[model samples]
Target: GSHMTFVALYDYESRTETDLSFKKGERLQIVDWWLARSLTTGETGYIPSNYVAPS
Candidate 1:
């Protein structure tokens, strides 16, 4: 699938307003290195790449 998601291992706070902040184990859809959408929340924004792994 061209679609990909990641699971956060720890809490992450966005450094910018456009960034995506999420808690541990939150699955987020990969839009790009700096952008993603939460699977559970349906909220799309930025995320730190290292803060997640393929799910």
Candidate 2:
């Protein structure tokens, strides 16, 4: 619950099982250093650190 909140800066469609799909402006919760869980979908997977920023 102490994880940082982030907002996607660009849309990303997951291309593999380990990646998470998210749309621009969507809220995400950091689950790991480069992993995140979608607040909109409750799905967890890896994400590009550069694709998001602190919200």
Candidate 3:
């Protein structure tokens, strides 16, 4: 399978590890709509869909 990553363009918040949040300019692995795994932190969780752009 092909994997894709994106860069955050805005700050976001989440309540838990699975409910992930990230800062602007952070890169994240696109796990799905429910969550994304951070490339910088090596953490996986939910991220707001509008905040990231393809990297």
Candidate 4:
């Protein structure tokens, strides 16, 4: 019942993608700090949604 999309919003002017992209179902090893924010808002900033695994 949960899923996420990983995308790199491009800034073509710079000719380089921002350092923000992740595969599906990736797990951040030390992710305690992200617990509260992970399921809420755009915590990862410009790279809002990254690798998403079932919580």
Say which candidate scores most in TM-score: 2
Using all chains and alpha carbons, the TM-scores for the candidates as numbered come to 0.83, 0.87, 0.77, 0.22
Per-residue lDDT over 1-55 for candidate 3, one digit per residue giving the tens place of the 0 to 100 score: 4447789999888876467778999999876354788988888888877788888
Model 1 steric clash pairs = 20-46
Off by over 4 Å in 1: none
Candidate 2 lDDT, tens digit per residue, 1-55? 5448999999999999899999999999987338888999999999998899988
Clashing pairs in model 3, backbone N/Cα/C closer than 3 A: 20-46
Which predicted model would earn the best lDDT? 2
Please give the lDDT score for candidate 2.
Answer: 0.89
* Segments of candidate 4 deviating more than 4 angstroms: 1-19, 29-46, 49-54
Candidate 3: C-alpha lDDT: 0.81
User: What TM-score, to 2 decimals, does candidate 3 have?
Assistant: 0.77
The per-prediction CA RMSD against the true structure, in angstroms, equals 2.0, 2.3, 2.4, 10.4
Once fitted onto the true fold, the runs of candidate 3 whose alpha carbons sit more than 4 angstroms away are: 1-3
CA lDDT of each candidate?
0.85, 0.89, 0.81, 0.28
Cα lDDT tens digits, model 1, 1-55, are 8448789988988787798889999999887356889988899998888888888
